[PDB]
Design a protein around this ligand. Structure first.
Ligand SMILES: [K+]
Ligand SMILES: [K+]
Ligand SMILES: [K+]
Ligand SMILES: [K+]
Ligand SMILES: [K+]
Ligand SMILES: [K+]
Ligand SMILES: [K+]
Ligand SMILES: [K+]
Ligand SMILES: [K+]
Ligand SMILES: [Mg+2]
Ligand SMILES: [Mg+2]
Ligand SMILES: [Mg+2]
Ligand SMILES: [Mg+2]
Ligand SMILES: [Mg+2]
Ligand SMILES: [Mg+2]
Ligand SMILES: [Mg+2]
Ligand SMILES: [Mg+2]
Ligand SMILES: [Mg+2]
Ligand SMILES: [Mg+2]
Ligand SMILES: [Mg+2]
Ligand SMILES: [Mg+2]
Ligand SMILES: [Mg+2]
Ligand SMILES: [Mg+2]
Ligand SMILES: [Mg+2]
Ligand SMILES: [Mg+2]
Ligand SMILES: [Mg+2]
Ligand SMILES: [Mg+2]
Ligand SMILES: [Mg+2]
Ligand SMILES: [Mg+2]
Ligand SMILES: [Mg+2]
Ligand SMILES: [Mg+2]
Ligand SMILES: [Mg+2]
Ligand SMILES: [Mg+2]
Ligand SMILES: [Mg+2]
Ligand SMILES: [Mg+2]
Ligand SMILES: [Mg+2]
Ligand SMILES: [Zn+2]
Lengths: 118, 147, 101, 111, 49, 53
RNA sequence: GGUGUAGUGGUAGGAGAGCGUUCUAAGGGCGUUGAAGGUCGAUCGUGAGGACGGCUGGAGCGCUUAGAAGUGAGAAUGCCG
RNA sequence: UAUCCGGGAGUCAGACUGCGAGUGAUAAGAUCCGUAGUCGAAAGGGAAACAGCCCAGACCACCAGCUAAGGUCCCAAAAUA
RNA sequence: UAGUGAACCAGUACCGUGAGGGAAAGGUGAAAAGCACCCCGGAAGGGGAGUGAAAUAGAUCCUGAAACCGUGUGCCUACAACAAGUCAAAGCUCGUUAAUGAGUGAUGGCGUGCCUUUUGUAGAAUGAACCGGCGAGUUACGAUUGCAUGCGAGGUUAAGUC
């Protein structure tokens, strides 16, 4: 009852290689290099699915800060004022308003400043 | 939803500002200038796209150096030859080549990448109060409160 | 006219006639849904919810339930001869916005 | 119908050296290619010329194409079988020798 | 019973454990023997007692 | 000294960039119209400078 | 099956449950109107992995239940090509 | 949660940090104990980079929110408070 | 690459003074019907024309993977410091198992391979040139424990005969 190698080996390695399409040279051509690279890609992918959330929050914060400065306020003062005024609009929506609906962002800033004054 | 706005190259209008360096500490002038050049002052800021505005610095010769920086702050550079170290004091740079002084200060503050170098090109420094870029219709950018 | 509404622990901007993808909602396909937490309403004029705009609701219809593209979590530690592989397809509900109040 | 090809298989010549001459003639009128191959001193020029002339003969005899219009649309050299040989070296050890061979293909089209 | 529907009694039979067949199985590489030493050698180990 | 690392296909191709043949000096032969090398005898008609040789 | 609460990093290592390979039995199938194999694809599952199409190929092969193993390789200055 | 009975192990090279001692020179990233932690076998944030220090334990998805250490002039998120 | 070393003119070739060591190497097609004739070429080899269900089954002949080599081109690339990815993304090109599509990718963020062995390795410690195949806890007889079945103060046959 001999079980010769068969085709499972080729199938598994081909799956890895297909995962490695687009890599540089041997990193997509050769199974060993491809696998080693695919593992690093998995490591980076898992790590970046977390870093991606940080990056976009950072981006929204920066844009909100610019808009707040134009309206006569710092980012920190704006957020403190919004918390005082009970505004729960998050940073994603705030950044979108700053870029697209400048009037709406200005209205938000006015309420924030009023809460700060009170 | 993946709706965050991303600026495109060339869609953003870049204005021109004039910054007067008279009696402004070198570093503080440079910091505000670098933010403007990067575009941190505009809501459309997009890290992977250049969106900042152009800066014309005038009166570079009158930039302020607090403390004894005029004689103790030393700019080094190595020619990459053995014993090829050269130095020049910040005061000497201000007297002779003030453009270099401001440019080095702002290079240090911009990112060290292709985008950062491109943004640096948008800076123009002139010792004295007159610049050749009237054709661009630059507008004065007060920084008294920004520093 | 547009609104910003609270849904699935997240805030979404909604425009009439525009579909939106949200965390799976326990509503059958083709049935009406109403979002009651409207944190902002904008357009020609702006209304700001503090924290929610009073008596503002947004109506939609659940076009579809689906699963996003698979995501693979492959956790391994180099030189420790140990790896773990996992798959995930996040369910989502697609809702076409009918009316903004 | 519009194109004719000729192939010389298992030609004893270096594929790389042959590819040098092939790159010279690719994408040129048949007349220009003949001239280039006739004045090239490298060995593979003669072999490539025989293949090119064979292809032109095919285009005319078999398919009655217009010789004057013909141009070299496609030409390439593929690795052939390699004969394995050994060369004695210092201290009673041999080193392998690869006696390469080439497949030379020339395709000539009407225009 | 039917030859095409055989079913052993629950818990009557178990699957043999095979060592040295990959890490995720829990007996890859070292095959449960640990790291070096006498007990990790083929035919290794000391006499009883 | 021996190669520390094998040469990749890309680097190998880059190096061979300049490993190319060239053909210069061909122009039509006055006597017979065939292509010939300038300043050489025409191998076809065996004429140079308009005279048989 | 529902709800609730709690929990779910991990080497040596213990336990549990599975994927896939060849073969045997039984049942039920598929194949010159194209099997296995090869190749491509934007496909499915929580994982090993499973389908379905196009092309190639030219004669054997799946599926369900159970059984037996030369049953899974990426490393051994491993052997052969 | 502890015992007790039984099946199966691996481990007998440890490292650093804080605190208490010896050896050393009140030297060593030294050595040898006691005690706690971390690494080992722990990813993440901070300490520029930096196993062992500070904060904190990754089952997963999110272009949501609040904080820890550590930070808020520019690189570089946030006070030219 | 299994099965005898040997499926084939194998204990041959080959190696060694000798004892002795010791290989590699199977498959056209149903049937040779194994490409008459013509064309380039000195030939080899091709292109037609034919045989054939099929010649990309043409004798290196079933299938024909990967490494490796080359031709064509949709996108990108000559101011850039790159474990080569991943995350974000314009532009261009294309339209699929029709899926909140596919290829490429300027630019930006993060980021020192795999394995072994170590207190600790990106390690300037070890192993791998690449690809493919082969390549490591098995069996017999006993001991013991768990689980399962039958019988139960009982349980059970061994050799041997049919
Ligand atoms: K064990
Ligand atoms: K297929
Ligand atoms: K090997
Ligand atoms: K025990
Ligand atoms: K201690
Ligand atoms: K065939
Ligand atoms: K290519
Ligand atoms: K990158
Ligand atoms: K060494
Ligand atoms: Mg194998
Ligand atoms: Mg977070
Ligand atoms: Mg000799
Ligand atoms: Mg068994
Ligand atoms: Mg284990
Ligand atoms: Mg291993
Ligand atoms: Mg070992
Ligand atoms: Mg040991
Ligand atoms: Mg041991
Ligand atoms: Mg956990
Ligand atoms: Mg089979
Ligand atoms: Mg095996
Ligand atoms: Mg190998
Ligand atoms: Mg020590
Ligand atoms: Mg250890
Ligand atoms: Mg850590
Ligand atoms: Mg480590
Ligand atoms: Mg906060
Ligand atoms: Mg900042
Ligand atoms: Mg201050
Ligand atoms: Mg043999
Ligand atoms: Mg074929
Ligand atoms: Mg064949
Ligand atoms: Mg430059
Ligand atoms: Mg360039
Ligand atoms: Mg050591
Ligand atoms: Mg090596
Ligand atoms: Zn002539």
């Amino acid at each position: 009852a001999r079980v010769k190698g068969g085709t499972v080996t080729r199938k598994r390695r081909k799956k890895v290689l297909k995962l490695a399409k687009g890599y540089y040279g041997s990193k997509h051509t050769l199974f060993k290099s491809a696998k080693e690279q695919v593992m690093n890609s998995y490591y980076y992918a898992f790590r970046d699915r977390r870093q991606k959330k940080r990056d976009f929050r950072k981006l929204w914060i920066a844009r909100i800060n610019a808009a707040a400065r134009m309206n006569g306020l710092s980012y920190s003062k704006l957020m403190h004022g919004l918390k005082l005024a009970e505004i729960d609009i998050n940073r994603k929506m705030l950044a979108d308003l700053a870029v697209n609906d400048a009037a709406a962002f200005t209205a938000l800033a006015e309420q924030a400043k009023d809460a700060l004054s009170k | 939803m993946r709706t965050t706005y991303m600026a495109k190259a060339g869609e953003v209008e870049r204005k021109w500002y004039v910054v007067d360096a008279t009696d402004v500490p070198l570093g503080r002038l440079s910091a505000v200038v670098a933010s403007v050049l990067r575009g941190k002052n505009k809501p459309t800021f997009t890290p992977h796209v250049d969106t900042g505005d152009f800066v014309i610095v005038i009166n570079a010769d009158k930039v302020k150096l607090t403390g004894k920086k005029a004689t103790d702050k030393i700019y080094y550079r190595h020619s990459m030859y053995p014993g090829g170290l050269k130095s020049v004091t910040a005061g000497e740079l201000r007297d002779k080549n003030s453009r270099r002084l401001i440019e080095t200060s702002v290079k240090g503050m911009l990112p060290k990448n292709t985008l950062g170098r491109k943004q640096f090109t948008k800076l123009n420094v002139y010792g004295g109060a007159e610049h050749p870029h009237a054709a661009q219709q630059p507008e004065v950018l007060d920084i008294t409160n920004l520093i | 006219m547009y609104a910003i509404i609270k849904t699935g622990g997240k805030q979404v901007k909604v425009e009439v006639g525009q579909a939106i993808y949200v965390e799976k909602l326990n509503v059958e396909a083709g049935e009406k849904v109403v979002f009651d937490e409207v944190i902002l309403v904008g357009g020609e004029s702006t209304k700001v919810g503090a924290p929610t705009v009073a008596g503002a609701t947004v109506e939609g219809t659940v076009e579809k339930h689906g699963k996003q593209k698979k995501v693979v979590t492959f956790q391994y530690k180099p030189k420790k001869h140990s790896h773990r592989k996992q798959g995930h397809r996040q369910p989502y509900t697609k809702v076409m916005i009918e009316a903004i109040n | 119908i519009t194109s004719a090809k000729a192939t010389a298989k298992t030609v004893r010549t270096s594929p790389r050296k042959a590819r040098l001459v092939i790159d010279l003639i690719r994408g040129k009128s048949v007349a220009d290619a003949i001239s280039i191959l006739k004045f090239t001193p490298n060995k593979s020029a003669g072999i490539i010329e025989k293949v090119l002339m064979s292809a032109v003969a095919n285009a005319e005899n078999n398919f009655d194409l217009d010789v004057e219009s013909l141009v070299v649309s496609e030409a390439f050299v593929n690795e052939g079988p390699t004969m394995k040989r050994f060369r004695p070296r210092a201290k009673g050890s041999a080193s392998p020798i690869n006696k390469r061979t080439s497949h030379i293909t020339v395709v000539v089209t009407e225009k | 019973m039917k030859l095409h529907e055989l079913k052993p009694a629950e818990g009557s039979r178990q699957v043999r454990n095979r060592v040295g067949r990959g890490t995720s199985s829990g007996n890859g590489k070292t095959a449960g023997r640990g790291q070096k030493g006498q007990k990790a050698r083929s035919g290794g180990g000391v006499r009883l007692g | 000294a021996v190669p520390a690392r094998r040469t990749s296909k890309a680097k190998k191709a880059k190096r061979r960039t300049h490993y190319k043949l060239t053909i210069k000096g061909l122009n039509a032969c006055s006597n017979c119209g065939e292509m010939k090398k300038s300043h050489h005898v025409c191998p076809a008609c065996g004429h140079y400078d308009g005279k048989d040789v």
